[PDB]
Structure formats: C-alpha cells, structure tokens
Amino acid sequence: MTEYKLVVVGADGVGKSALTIQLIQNHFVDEYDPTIEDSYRKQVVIDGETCLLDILDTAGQEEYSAMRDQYMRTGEGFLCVFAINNTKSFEDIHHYREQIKRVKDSEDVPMVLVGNKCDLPSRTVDTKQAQDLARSYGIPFIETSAKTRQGVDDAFYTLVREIRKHK
C-alpha cells in the first residue's frame, strides 16, 4: 500500500490540530489545547488508490522549534497553514518554507499553502495576497475551515497528489 508522510506546520493557533481532527474524525474542536507532537495513520481512497496517510500534527509554539529538524527530514509533504485572521501567521509561513527547503536541500519540496479559518469574518490576509505568495513558491493554495470542513479534504488530497507527482 502506498504510504504518504504528511506534516502539518504553522504558527501557534492557526488550526493545525482542528484541521487534522476534522479530516479524520469529522467534527470540530472548539478548545485550544497546544500540541507538542501527535501522529495519526489513516487509510483513505484518493483518485481510486488506497493510500495510507501518516499525518504528523506539529507544535506551533516556538518553544518546540528544535523538533522541526527531525520532522522536516522525514516528512514527504508539508501542509503550511496560516489563519486568515492572523497576519503574523501568514508572515511566519516564509520561515517554515525556508527551513523545510534548507533541511531537504531542495526548492521542489511537496507543499500546499492553507489559509484556515475562512468561516470567520475577521479577515486580515486578502486571498489575493496569499495566492500571490503561493504562486511565488510554485505551490497550490487553498482556503479552509476546520469548522465547516470547507477545503479540508481538498487541502490534504492536493498535498498527496503533490507528493505522488513529484516522485
């Protein structure tokens, strides 16, 4: 069975855990329980292929930044999440991309830019500005909501397709 190693990264509070738990369990976590590092293994069918998704839900708290080196070496694709109402999380994206590129020693790492919390009216990052950043990196961009499930399956399945197409 083809196995895909996905890593969910981004600033503290953007909704990494809520996105992962929505994808796998189909419900929304309202509480904010900061992550150290959790992992999940889930079988899914993507484009008629039974896939094993190995999903690593990482820490956004900068206190755990030394753990990034290990997961960036082993991860095959990265879901780079910011929240549409948190401009600092959007600026933090570039730092995660640069770190991943350095650890892999490559500019062609499978990645998807995710603008989460798109259900909220408190937007601070225009969709066009995020589209422009994703175009500069050569990666897909999707807006998501862990509350409504908008874009959630597409974000994860697009990342699988980016890994599959790169190999």
Ligand X SMILES: Nc1nc2c(ncn2[C@@H]2O[C@H](COP(=O)(O)OP(=O)(O)CP(=O)(O)O)[C@@H](O)[C@H]2O)c(=O)[nH]1
Ligand Y SMILES: O=C1NCCc2c1[nH]c1c(-c3ccoc3)cccc21
Name the site residues for ligand X (rule: CB under 6 A).
Answer: 12-18, 29-30, 32, 34-35, 59-61, 116-117, 119-120, 145-147
Distance CA 55, CA 101 (A): 20
- Classify each residue of 48-80 as buried b or exposed e, where b means 16 or more C-beta atoms within 10 Å of its C-beta: eeebebbbbbbbbeeeeeeebeebbeebbbbbb
- Minimum CB distance to ligand X, residue 114 (Å): 10
Least Cα distance to 107 among 115, 98, 116 occurs for 98
Q: With respect to ligand X, which residue has the nearer C-beta, 93 or 146?
A: 146
Q: With respect to ligand Y, which residue has the nearer C-beta, 118 or 152?
A: 152
Q: With respect to Mg ion, which residue has the nearer C-beta, 35 or 150?
A: 35
Distance CA 148, CA 13 (A): 17
Q: Is 87 helix (H, G, I), strand (E, B) or coil?
A: helix
- Minimum CB distance to ligand Y, residue 148 (Å): 26
Strands (E) located in 21-163: 37-46, 49-58, 77-83, 111-116, 141-143
Could you say which of 2, 36, 37, 41 contacts ligand Y (CB under 6 A)?
A: 41
Q: Which two tokens stand for residue 25?
A: 């369990």
Rule CB under 6 A: say whether 10 interacts with ligand Y. Answer: no
Q: With respect to ligand Y, which residue has the nearer C-beta, 77 or 118?
A: 77
- Minimum CB distance to ligand X, residue 41 (Å): 19
Residues that bind ligand Y (CB under 6 A): 5-7, 39, 41, 54-56, 71, 74-75
